[PDB]
Amino acid sequence: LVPRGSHMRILITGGAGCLGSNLIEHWLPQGHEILVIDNFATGKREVLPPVAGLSVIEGSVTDAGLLERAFDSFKPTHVVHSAAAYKDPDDWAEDAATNVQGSINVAKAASKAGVKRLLNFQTALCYGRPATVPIPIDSPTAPFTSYGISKTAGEAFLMMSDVPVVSLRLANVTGPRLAIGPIPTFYKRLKAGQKCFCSDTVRDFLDMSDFLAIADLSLQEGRPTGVFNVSTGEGHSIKEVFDVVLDYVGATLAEPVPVVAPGADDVPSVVLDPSKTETEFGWKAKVDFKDTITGQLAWYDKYGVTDIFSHLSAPK
């Protein structure tokens, strides 16, 4: 079993999604054994080819018996909890079941199984309308949407675990198979010459490579535990994203792009302060904004705007 002396058996809930599939493509070539649990609510079957070292259970983190059996059999050394429901903002029941009860079941199962470390991903919706930007890690949680409320409580339950837990509050991560948001929107619209708009909002953006680096650190024995902000700590407007994409695809506009006031629930600025993560993990994001966006675009050049292109080579 390899990496010699550092071989992991990783159980990844939500492993068929964006971050989950990128983590598999990162870890599987290293010889780690991976078990995915996913219900394919938003994740895709085609990112999980029948390949060596990779096992898949189709099912839900809401199903505590299923998890018990999975943990019982697979005996994971490490857990990455990447499953989340969000696609229907009115389906509060689903959000609470997946994000709260799913987090509880994973924490309970991981404790019984003697998991070494659990890694959870948290949305910046946990902060609600922030008192200040960039957002300090000691900011209160103050969510006001179903996705935010349920994810805040799931994280909070995971923090009560006797399992060492790292919960990463994430900037917007970019990389293979990201097929939603302003980046692919501006890409498909500008190339097609369709009409675009930008919310007058500010966000942070993180290259996949820097995400993989902190994920790696979070799973190492005796590293820090708790909640951490993962970002460059720099905010850029949606308009700035747009200007990068427009220059990249080499289009000229007929009229100025509208930059419009955000809707009532669209938080104007959400940028995370990473300083404590830099202090405690020794980690710093290496990829600037322009390289992050253009890196996303270069992937699109190569594969299309698709969440189903796998970098793994079947059959086994």
Ligand X SMILES: NC(=O)c1ccc[n+]([C@@H]2O[C@H](COP(=O)([O-])OP(=O)(O)OC[C@H]3O[C@@H](n4cnc5c(N)ncnc54)[C@H](O)[C@@H]3O)[C@@H](O)[C@H]2O)c1
Ligand Y SMILES: O=c1ccn([C@@H]2O[C@H](COP(=O)(O)OP(=O)(O)O)[C@@H](O)[C@H]2O)c(=O)[nH]1
Q: Which residues are annotated as a binding site?
A: 18-19, 38, 41-43, 60-61, 84, 86, 98, 147, 151, 173, 197, 199, 201, 203, 266
- Site residues, ligand X (CB under 6 A): 13-14, 16-20, 37-43, 60-62, 82-85, 98, 102, 121-123, 151, 170, 172-173
In the bound state with ligand Y, the residue whose beta carbon lies nearer, of 33 and 273, is 273
In the bound state with its own copies, the residue whose beta carbon lies nearer, of 93 and 261, is 93
Q: For the sheet with 33-38, list strands across it.
A: 54-58, 33-38, 9-13, 78-81, 117-123, 165-170, 226-230
Structure tokens at 234: 């720099």
Does 174 contact its own copies by CB under 8 A?
A: no
Q: Give the residue from 148, 67, 159 showing the smallest Cα distance to 106.
A: 67
- The 124-143 contact track toward its own copies, x by CB under 8 A, reads ----------------xxxx
Binding piece for its own copies, criterion CB under 8 A, among 3-11, 70-78, 94-102, 198-206: 94-102
Binding piece for its own copies, criterion CB under 8 A, among 14-22, 99-107, 176-184, 194-202: 99-107
CA atoms within 13 A of residue 30's CA, in its CB half-sphere: 17
Nearest distance, CB of residue 105 and ligand X, angstroms = 10
Alpha helices in 90-165 (DSSP H): 92-95, 102-113, 146-159
Which of ligand X, its own copies, ligand Y, none does residue 19 bind (CB under 5 to 8 Å by kind)? ligand X
In the bound state with ligand X, the residue whose beta carbon lies nearer, of 108 and 191, is 108
C-alpha 11/C-alpha 103 separation (Å) is 14
Q: Give the residue from 251, 257, 241, 250 showing the smallest Cα distance to 290.
A: 241
- Quick one: 206 exposed, middle or buried, by C-beta within 10 A (0-12, 13-18, 19+)? buried
- At position 231, the amino acid (one-letter code) is S
Nearest distance, CB of residue 77 and ligand Y, angstroms = 33
In the bound state with ligand X, the residue whose beta carbon lies nearer, of 37 and 244, is 37
> Residues within the annotated binding site for UDP?
197, 199, 201, 203, 266
Which of ligand Y, ligand X, its own copies, none does residue 238 bind (CB under 5 to 8 Å by kind)? ligand Y
In the bound state with ligand X, the residue whose beta carbon lies nearer, of 43 and 235, is 43
Which of its own copies, ligand X, ligand Y, none does residue 159 bind (CB under 5 to 8 Å by kind)? its own copies
Beta strand segments in the chain, E: 9-13, 33-38, 54-58, 78-81, 117-123, 165-170, 172-174, 198-199, 202-203, 205-207, 226-230, 236-237, 259-260, 269-270
